[model samples]
Target: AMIKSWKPQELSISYHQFTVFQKDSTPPVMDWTDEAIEKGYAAADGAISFEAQRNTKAFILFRLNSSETVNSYEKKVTVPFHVTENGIHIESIMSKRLSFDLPKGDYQLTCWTVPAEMSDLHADTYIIDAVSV
Candidate 1:
């Protein structure tokens, strides 16, 4: 069963991007790939990144034992992640540190995105479902 976990309460971004990765590791220093930009999400280097429409709020939902089922969303992507440590971290283009700790193991980080224009006013939201592998 999937359960909502702790996440950053304030997720306003002007840069239209953010990332989720293993805690205390080097934050991914790469740009969004063309495929990522097209699909609205990507994963690499123990990190998952996502992009949204210009300057909006990104409501992040970090889940455990998440469902593989994909629902109504503009785009979605999944990536393999191994938690070397106990916690996972989140950061926006602004680089503020936000994180939550979980059990160490292999997991899949799946993300879904909907642009602000298509959804609510300033709702460039992102949902990340972490399913244990």
Candidate 2:
């Protein structure tokens, strides 16, 4: 089988607001191969991000479609996530800022979404306050 890889710089993407949709109805934002990462990956009024402590855990947080009443030209939502030696966890893609553990060393993470079917997704995200937790 061909090897899959994730982009490193995608972890640094920051935004105050963002929306995602397919122009040509291409593949998902996070394809194992070909081009995946797209535009407007930022959060709603907030933003999105990824972090790790190295051999420790990972954190990923975005916004919920709740109360957003966010509409879709067509539509679907899968959420975004990366991959690790642990075979990629499911919860890792559902929440905004997730705190999970990993082994050590550099790993790959593929940003994702759902089937590109009139999929218009919106949300607010960011690292606001850790003190609350």
Candidate 3:
């Protein structure tokens, strides 16, 4: 008899968003690493915290694409989050997880944010390749 086990080829990512006032102001920053944290997903360190405005609405979109066919999967998240003197805080929303069993190929992850009543911002996309399991 042969024994085999299932392993995930990919992992989940925690995407966060911060609202800013001026265009010249520092944009939201992030760091992506393969290191797994206690949350059982890849960790991303957010540079700055976001502050919220009264009745203001902000949105963050998480998009993923398979490198093989470049097929895309996107999810939009709305944050009515509030900011305090310490920093921006978000309620514990569920983490986004993605997995696949694809032969060696490339993949992409994009993150973007849009403020209420504002024009949509072009998303910044990042690509990573999967060599093997």
Candidate 4:
């Protein structure tokens, strides 16, 4: 039941992290605990962040109401995401701008991180889905 999706070109990332957040909202504060690093992702108010081992080429996917499935070399995490308005944005340390238009509601954001060489989709892929709760 994916309602919308954005698959931009392979992104060049720094700080080993990228974020997905509600538009016009405060940026997420990423606190990478041992557990978070083990899982390969983190969460904050209005945002979710992902980590990679290096500044590398990454692919991003935005899904709505997608199924729960996992692939090899991938870690999956779910976080509560509240859409205060009707838009969302994805940011990286490199500051490339990417965003989406979505409805205002509470969404369960499921994020997956597949490390390089482990993806059939793309290298360093981040798959995220928003399912209304």
lDDT of each: 0.70, 0.24, 0.25, 0.76
Model 2 RMSD, rounded to 1 decimal? 16.5
Give one clash count per candidate, in the order shown. 0, 13, 1, 0
Candidate with the greatest TM-score versus the true structure = 4
Instruction: Kindly list the per-residue Cα lDDT of model 2 for residues 1-133, writing each as its tens digit.
Output: 1222222111222221222221222122232122222331322211232221122122223222222333332222233432223321122232232222322222222233221232222221122111100
What is the model-wide C-alpha lDDT for candidate 3?
Answer: 0.25
* Regions more than 4 Å wrong, model 2: 1-97, 115-133
Model 1: per-residue Cα lDDT over 90-117, one tens digit each: 8887756678777688887777775655
Cα lDDT over the full model 4: 0.76
Task: Candidate 1: list runs displaced more than 4 Å.
Answer: 1-4, 68-70, 116-122
The candidate with the higher lDDT, 1 or 4, is 4
lDDT of 3 by residue, 12-39 (tens): 1234323221212233343323322111
CA shift at 22, candidate 1, in angstroms? Answer: 1.5
Better of 2 and 3 by lDDT: 3
**TM-score of model 2 vs. true structure:** 0.21
> Candidate 2 lDDT (Cα, whole model)?
0.24
